[PDB]
Amino acid sequence: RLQAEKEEEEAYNQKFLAEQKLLAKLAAHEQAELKQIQKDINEFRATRQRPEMER
């Protein structure tokens, strides 16, 4: 009995740490996404909204 329950507890913890690590990876991905969107906006200002193009 004690062997069985202890192994089940250990298995649960390793699953939870694996899921925690996954969320950390996506969180880093999100900030990388935000930087790219910011560079896209700088492109729009630099090349398409220009002072020589105002009405």
């Binding site: 200002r45 630099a46 002072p51």
Partner: protein, 430 residues
Amino acid sequence: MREVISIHVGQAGVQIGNGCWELYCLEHGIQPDGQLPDAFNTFFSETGAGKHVPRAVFVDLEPTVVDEVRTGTYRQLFHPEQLISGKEDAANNYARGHYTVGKEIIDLTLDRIRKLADQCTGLQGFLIFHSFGGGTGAGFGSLLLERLSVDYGKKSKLEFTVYPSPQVSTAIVEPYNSILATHSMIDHSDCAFMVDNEALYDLCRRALDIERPTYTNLNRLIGQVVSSLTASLRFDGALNVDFTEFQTNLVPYARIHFPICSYAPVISAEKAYHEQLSVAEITNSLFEPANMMVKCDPRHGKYMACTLLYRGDVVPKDVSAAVATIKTKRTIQFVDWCPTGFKMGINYQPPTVVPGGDLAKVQRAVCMLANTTAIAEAWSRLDHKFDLMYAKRAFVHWYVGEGMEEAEFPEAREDLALLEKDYDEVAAES
């Protein structure tokens, strides 16, 4: 769905209007012909399966301004009935625009606005634009609202008018028209927003990087505020604000309604590349006296309840921290009986940029409407200018000849005087 009707008066109202509808058709995705290459129902109607039409009426007593739209590229969008032009303008004379010439066209227009209200199943209010110095803007604008008040009654009639500037002036009789229209405005209007050209000139030269602007650029900046104001009714948002909410939240009393406008960030294209422009940054920029669209310093007076409208990438967590910080600012005053003092709204859809517009594209922006006792500064200047001319009675003969009785001059003069101490009593605290 839910509907809003726009009415435009005078040269200022009309040529502001076509600028606003230029934005709105661009925003929704409608070609100038009305076809497509959603939230259309709040502003447009579908005729059969393909074509849209604005819920707008353009009114002026002279044809030059209206016929520019009639021959323009946008001419196919509007219904021919919506463009109403008089024969000869009011010549910046309130009496002519109210009594003699105004009544020649009032009933023709009232049918057309009412007919458009049939198509609006869930109508909730109207927007009306004025220029105070204009004869038709002040004279016919008063007559329109007096009739409209009894026609509809319990409907929210919001106004968006141009207050004459502290020093910049184009009409000599300008103080006369403003006071006379003010007395009619105050009882009938639910709420009316103040703006002036002089503050818009300074902002659009300082913040927006333009040496030599025209009325065209200023009409764009007005459109941005109105678009954000209506953004809650059209697109999704985490905190929606309907028209009726502005009426109750902003005005403490019946006569104290007049708010003022502000908007941030206003920044040039190549400077927005240089600056971060987060949620806290734009909130701080709203409260500086430079960004106010009315050239009155709020530091002379005190703040009552203020309304904030955010658009774009803003998240509710960052909003609360930003406004909490602005309470710590001791250069901002609040009356004691308004501890809450704020009404906030957050919307997702970013501002819509324009072909060849000067404003940069920030993914987050904020709009403000604030009610302050600093507006009493503007009333004192307008009153002083009127008092000088009326003492020697420098222009009475023109108004009396066009149907106006003189006894209206002191009565409207007293009604403004009552409003002046209306604001001073509110400014006090216990």
